[PDB]
Amino acid sequence: PIVQNLQGQMVHQAISPRTLNAWVKVVEEKAFSPEVIPMFSALSEGATPQDLNTMLNTVGGHQAAMQMLKETINEEAAEWDRLHPVHAGPIEPGQMREPRGSDIAGTTSTLQEQIGWMTHNPPIPVGEIYKRWIILGLNKIVRMYSPTSILDIRQGPKEPFRDYVDRFYKTLRAEQASQEVKNWMTETLLVQNANPDCKTILKALGPAATLEEMMTACQGVGGPGHKARVL
Amino acid sequence: PIVQNLQGQMVHQAISPRTLNAWVKVVEEKAFSPEVIPMFSALSEGATPQDLNTMLNTVGGHQAAMQMLKETINEEAAEWDRLHPVHAGPIEPGQMREPRGSDIAGTTSTLQEQIGWMTHNPPIPVGEIYKRWIILGLNKIVRMYSPTSILDIRQGPKEPFRDYVDRFYKTLRAEQASQEVKNWMTETLLVQNANPDCKTILKALGPAATLEEMMTACQGVGGPGHKARVL
Amino acid sequence: PIVQNLQGQMVHQAISPRTLNAWVKVVEEKAFSPEVIPMFSALSEGATPQDLNTMLNTVGGHQAAMQMLKETINEEAAEWDRLHPVHAGPIEPGQMREPRGSDIAGTTSTLQEQIGWMTHNPPIPVGEIYKRWIILGLNKIVRMYSPTSILDIRQGPKEPFRDYVDRFYKTLRAEQASQEVKNWMTETLLVQNANPDCKTILKALGPAATLEEMMTACQGVGGPGHKARVL
Amino acid sequence: PIVQNLQGQMVHQAISPRTLNAWVKVVEEKAFSPEVIPMFSALSEGATPQDLNTMLNTVGGHQAAMQMLKETINEEAAEWDRLHPVHAGPIEPGQMREPRGSDIAGTTSTLQEQIGWMTHNPPIPVGEIYKRWIILGLNKIVRMYSPTSILDIRQGPKEPFRDYVDRFYKTLRAEQASQEVKNWMTETLLVQNANPDCKTILKALGPAATLEEMMTACQGVGGPGHKARVL
Amino acid sequence: PIVQNLQGQMVHQAISPRTLNAWVKVVEEKAFSPEVIPMFSALSEGATPQDLNTMLNTVGGHQAAMQMLKETINEEAAEWDRLHPVHAGPIEPGQMREPRGSDIAGTTSTLQEQIGWMTHNPPIPVGEIYKRWIILGLNKIVRMYSPTSILDIRQGPKEPFRDYVDRFYKTLRAEQASQEVKNWMTETLLVQNANPDCKTILKALGPAATLEEMMTACQGVGGPGHKARVL
């Protein structure tokens, strides 16, 4: 890693086995999930492409996800190359050096080249660009693996509107859906299957109402096993 | 986070996984509940919008509550835009742009802009502003998922009067009656929701007696459960 | 509107009566439908804000919709003055006097001022800006009034798929639903309610089948697909 | 009508037969619908008193109504001579003569004088004055040809109530009422004739009740979205 | 559209609403016939993408055809993108960018861009290019709503030979066959699929018989040569 970038007095430190092992223990606990992404970002503060490759290659589990994440890196590298201006050929004093797709992912570029770009004025932030591609891959992996079905998170007929809301938002955890689609899913899977007295209020509130209003609603409505409206 | 933020010129220091690990552990142990709010306020000392978003993305669980909190910060951001509208045209060359609600939430803005606003004179303290919106959301979650009501509470059958006063005060901290009302509860409601063998003792003692005297009162009420707790 | 005989625009002249009738008649026969906006765009080329108000005033149908549309214009007019800083002190060198938000909607300034702004070089595009506010208002009305049932389409036993598709897309077009919802309508209705003889081909093309392949399917299959119409 | 040849330079043009067709049809075939006032305003844009008099006597239906229009013109022409000197002495050298009430209505004036006043500096907008007098005549006829009094309006048992509001606002275009009276109608007539779901919105909101709330209510009744309102 | 300029490069002319009214009327009656393509070409003379989009979205009927045009535009635009990679680096001083597939469709291109390409040196005729893509789509649509392919066109039991040949050519015109296929079909298929009693007569005049010779034969085949209307 490189520390004090944008702060003055930059220091290069070697990647620690302790940090790599701590990262693997985090991966063992949390797998590839929404909460692992800021932990990965925090661990990768001032990481070079070589440091990032070392972090990717130290993982033992979830190898199908790692190869698919590597495909996402390959697609981003191919895109990066595709939109890049024309770099000069094998010139006699040695090449000028501007990071191409495989340079960004550390494959064709050295640690000293990566340090060269990161210590430039203005900096060329090769580790940050690569880290964004890894995050884009992590979002892709989180969407690819689904925890629960839309079928089984449907609202209980006598139950209140609480736990099913958690399950619905766990189900759609990294999805990118529009507010109109999200409301239609909320209505179809939850509001439609709600108890009559609660449901009329939720239907009356409709799509452009707050979640807070929908949670606040349904006063004077009974529990699932209770035999009267009062609790 | 920012360092040299009291009587100085601030420097940005990168976020630690150790701080995040502590936050994740506090959320694991204590969920969102009254004692969490000052702990959150304390770790939000010297925090940027990026750091605050880093804390929000490390929560993991609590999906419906987090969605309501996200809407709450969006409502507060919309109020900030309504109060302080920003001009229709692009910014002039040579002029520093004005913070919008999205910029404060860190969804259309980056650290250098944020440092710029915090180094205005008088400054715009964007992390302090955003933290207050998040704290309102957390206080809203605590009210939504409150444990039992302060009116409805009763002294337990195996519960010492002292340990009841603590549980009543914990309940009150969730239920948040005003300071004048807390003083009224201390001399009134606290006595009235006690067990009836202790009610006579409290009336004879005088309901305005000091809290240490109260913590040393009604000893032996609560059968063998009292005797297995006062040792 | 503003016209000139040998190209360009200069002299203001009265709204043409065939054009005025054509505007009233498209609204009368089609109501608040997507095809009104392009016809309105063609008719209102070089119209003043006064002429645009004449168009809004002339239609005697749908007054409740007009009140909502007018209030939409009021939000935009208020917003325009709120996002452009108010000038005080002496008017600028060679400044003819800028349009305000209520001036743009023709409420508070003369036809002579409007002509002055529009015959300016390059033009100050007050009519073009005002019809955006009108189009936004119309789209809010189109949401209220355009939709029809797509569930309640009823076709004969051996009807051509191409003639069901024609009915389905006219119906789908009337719906203002977001694309994922429209895909759900397409999945649950169009390939499921279709004639058996063509339905086998739709299943053979597979559940991701594209429309050109679907419309080239089923040659000489079904009834005529052209009778019992224009009755 | 007058029409601009160059900016500030006007030539007379013959009246369009389209204008005559539209005017007679709105007056006679739509039997004094309140769209006559904006249609008259739109069609009379370049009109002179001679054009307006030609329009007045091309009507063959409703000759009692035409006499009421003529009487309204006679009364307003009398008012002009009440508020402007009837004797101005000998008219000034190189000045147009001051217009009497009869001159405004094209009775003692000629077309050359009418164009002369309207193209003067300061200009006298003689047609625009005469249009107001005609509009006052139209308004009384429109009230007389209004079929039913506003408080006596009724509904069917499965009315969505959107049309009742649409009819109520259209009715106020024919026979007007003050804002305080309309506020009273909003809390009386509308509350009585509304279905429970719409009525709850009216009862809660009072006179300033917002149309979008009631237009996003009453879905179970079977109105728009179940029945087509667009072709 | 853009029209001839006597003093320089061709100038904007606002879109005719008469052309829109004619275009919709043509689509209602003539859209499933090869008649539509020349009529569309005559109507769309000098049209920009904006003019073409205005024509396409004024059509609210025939939505299966409109969706088929849009599907064709997607397919054609993608083929244009395969033909032209997007340039990296800044645009040349005073120059304008190459158009991509979305630009041709009018989606990403301004009226100044559309006119700028069409007045370029050498000009890029983007309106004509978009119009041929629409024509390619219309050519699919006429065949899609044609009753079957030409190989299955056979002479009916009471159908005249001349009427069958007119129908055969109308169906062949919908199919759009290459010239030697049409010649072979005239020589062979037309004779082969004719009525058996007619077909022996067609054979008698040999395979060198002209269309004039062939339709000189076959009198007393099917119903009347000169029809009567039924009431």
Encoded tokens for D92: 């000034």
Which chains have at least 3 CB atom pairs separated by less than 8 Å from chain C? Answer: A, B, D, E
Chain C / chain E CB contacts < 8 angstroms:
79
β-strand partners of B2: B12
Long-range CB contacts (< 8 A, 24+ apart) of C199-207?
A: C202/C161
Q: CA angle, A180 as apex, A176 and A181 as ends, to 5°? A: 55
CB distance D130 to D101 below 8 Å = no
Quote the radius of gyration of chain C (alpha carbons, Å): 24
Residues whose CB falls within 8 Å of the CB of residue C190, separated by 6 or more in sequence, listed in order: C164, C165, C168
CA dist C74 and E68 (Å) reads 40
CA dist E171 and E151 (Å) reads 10
User: Nearest Cα to A206, choosing from D205, C68, D216?
Assistant: D216
C181/A177 touch (CB, cutoff 8 Å), yes or no: no
Closest-approach residue (CA) in chain A for D200 = A204
Nearest chain A Cα distance for residue B86, angstroms: 25
C211/E67 touch (CB, cutoff 8 Å), yes or no: yes
Count the neighbouring beta carbons within 10 Å of the beta carbon of residue C231.
3
CA dist C78 and C133 (Å) reads 11
Q: Which helix (H) or strand (E) holds A77?
A: helix A63-82
Beta strands at D2-6 and D9-12: parallel, antiparallel or unpaired: antiparallel
Q: Do chains E and B touch (3 or more CB pairs under 8 A)?
A: no
Amino acid code (one letter) for B136: L
Q: Considering only CB atoms, which chain B residues are within 8 Å of C82? A: 85
Q: How was this structure determined?
A: cryo-EM
Amino acid code (one letter) for A206: G
Closest-approach residue (CA) in chain B for C80 = B88
A45/B14 touch (CB, cutoff 8 Å), yes or no: yes
Using an 8 Å CB-CB cutoff, list residues of chain C that contact chain D.
10-15, 17-18, 20-21, 29-33, 54, 57-60, 62-65, 67-68, 71, 119, 144-149, 174
Count the neighbouring beta carbons within 10 Å of the beta carbon of residue C78.
12
Closest-approach residue (CA) in chain D for A207 = D216
CA dist D222 and D128 (Å) reads 47
β-strand partners of D4: D10
Q: Which residues of B178-204 are buried (b: 16+ CB within 10 A; e: fewer)?
A: eeeeeeebbeebbbebbbeebbebbee
Q: Considering only CB atoms, which chain B residues are within 8 Å of A29? A: none
Closest-approach residue (CA) in chain E for A84 = E88
CA dist D93 and E135 (Å) reads 71
A165/B62 touch (CB, cutoff 8 Å), yes or no: no
Alpha-carbon distances of B76 from B70, B108, B134, C121, D87, rounded to whole Å: 10, 16, 9, 43, 69
Encoded tokens for B108: 């259309």
User: Nearest Cα to E1, choosing from E11, E10, E13?
Assistant: E13
The burial of A24, by beta-carbon neighbours within 10 Å (0-12 exposed, 13-18 middle, 19 or more buried), is given as: middle
The burial of A194, by beta-carbon neighbours within 10 Å (0-12 exposed, 13-18 middle, 19 or more buried), is given as: buried
Q: How many residues does chain B have?
A: 231
User: Nearest Cα to C181, choosing from D128, A181, D179?
Assistant: A181
CB distance B53 to B20 below 8 Å = no
CA dist B207 and B221 (Å) reads 18
CB distance E118 to E124 below 8 Å = yes
SS3 A160: coil
Q: Which residues of A62-90 are buried (b: 16+ CB within 10 A; e: fewer)?
A: eeebbeebeebbeebbeebeeeeeeeeee
Closest-approach residue (CA) in chain A for E86 = A83
A203/D197 touch (CB, cutoff 8 Å), yes or no: no
Which chains have at least 3 CB atom pairs separated by less than 8 Å from chain B? Answer: A, C
B63/A165 touch (CB, cutoff 8 Å), yes or no: yes
Closest-approach residue (CA) in chain A for B60 = A35
C220/E152 touch (CB, cutoff 8 Å), yes or no: yes
Nearest chain C Cα distance for residue E68, angstroms: 7
User: Nearest Cα to B159, choosing from B212, B197, B200, B209?
Assistant: B197
A38/B54 touch (CB, cutoff 8 Å), yes or no: yes
CA dist D197 and C96 (Å) reads 53
Q: Considering only CB atoms, which chain A residues are within 8 Å of C175? A: none
CA dist B123 and C227 (Å) reads 75
Residue with tokens 């090769």: A126
